[PDB]
Amino acid sequence: LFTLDGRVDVPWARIVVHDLINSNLIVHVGNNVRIDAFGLKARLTGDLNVVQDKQGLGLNGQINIPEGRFHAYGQDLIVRKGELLFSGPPDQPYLNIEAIRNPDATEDDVIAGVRVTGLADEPKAEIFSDP
Amino acid sequence: PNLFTLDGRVDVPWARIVVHDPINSNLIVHVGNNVRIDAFGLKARLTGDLNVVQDKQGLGLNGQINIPEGRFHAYGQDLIVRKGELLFSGPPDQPYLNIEAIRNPDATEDDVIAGVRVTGLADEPKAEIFSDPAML
């Protein structure tokens, strides 16, 4: 069987989603990595230890969202803080995300702000009013 | 049915590759200064650049991998890689080879082999065995 261990740097990438064998890798997400997916347009940074063995894929580390905009479902929000903390299960990071109304938004009834926290399948969301 | 696209650049400053016994992407992979392979008697350091492109038709691989240093265990003997290049021109599992490896046969009158050179597509290569270390 083949194994691959190492360190990988991703200085730039573009990930878009359009509607219309064995490893241990440390992956460093560099300074021009952007995603456009599911209403989120964002820049991502961070570091992940990607372990793959017979049981499956493990992810440990942190992915951060230094800048982003979520525009979907009548809502236009600017990400003020965004962190995903992975502790093994790839589909279950801990979320800590804050976003506020885009003051340039054209839609009305856009929430003043939201915070989403907790494991991605047990999340909690706080929705704030304008003072 | 939704389309996933991935473009970008990947740098691999460190790696160890051991061999025991709808998505569109275009990636530039730069193989850096501490990438080594251990497989089938070959212990070698690798460098170079590969463009990996993937779409509905399949995977394509283009670029060049160099072997700046390596050794190869064949029969009871050891050969030191003097020059090594693999050229990828589309088919990922069929690079063009050009590899030269040498050993010293001069201790004994009988020992003849001074070098080996392997050239051609990886599935139908030619091997030249030389008694002069020169290969010219």
Numbering used by the authors:
A (entry chain B): 977 to 996, 1026 to 1136
B (entry chain A): 975 to 995, 1025 to 1139
From the paper:
In this work, we report the crystal structure of TamB963-1138 from E. coli, a region spanning half of the conserved DUF490 domain. One of these constructs, consisting of residues 963–1,138 of TamB (designated TamB963-1138) produced diffraction quality crystals and data was collected and anisotropically processed to 1.86–2.2 Å (Josts et al., 2014, Strong et al., 2006). As no homologs of TamB have been structurally characterized, selenomethionine-labeled protein was prepared, crystalized, and the structure was solved using single-wavelength anomalous dispersion (SAD). The crystal structure of TamB963-1138 revealed an elongated taco-shaped molecule consisting entirely of β sheet and random coil. This β taco structure is formed by two molecules of TamB963-1138, which interact via their N-terminal β strand to form a continuous 16-stranded curved β structure. Between the first and second β strands 29 residues lack electron density due to disorder. Proline residues 987 and 1,071 at the center of β strands 1 and 4 and glycine 1,035 at the center of β strand 2 create a discontinuity which kinks of the β sheet, facilitating the curvature of the β taco. The most striking feature of the TamB963-1138 crystal structure is that the interior surface of its β taco is populated entirely by aliphatic and aromatic residues, making this interior cavity highly hydrophobic. During purification of TamB963-1138 it was found that the detergent lauryldimethylamine N-oxide (LDAO) was required for stabilization of the domain. Electron density possibly attributable to the aliphatic chains of stabilizing LDAO molecules is evident inside the TamB963-1138 cavity.
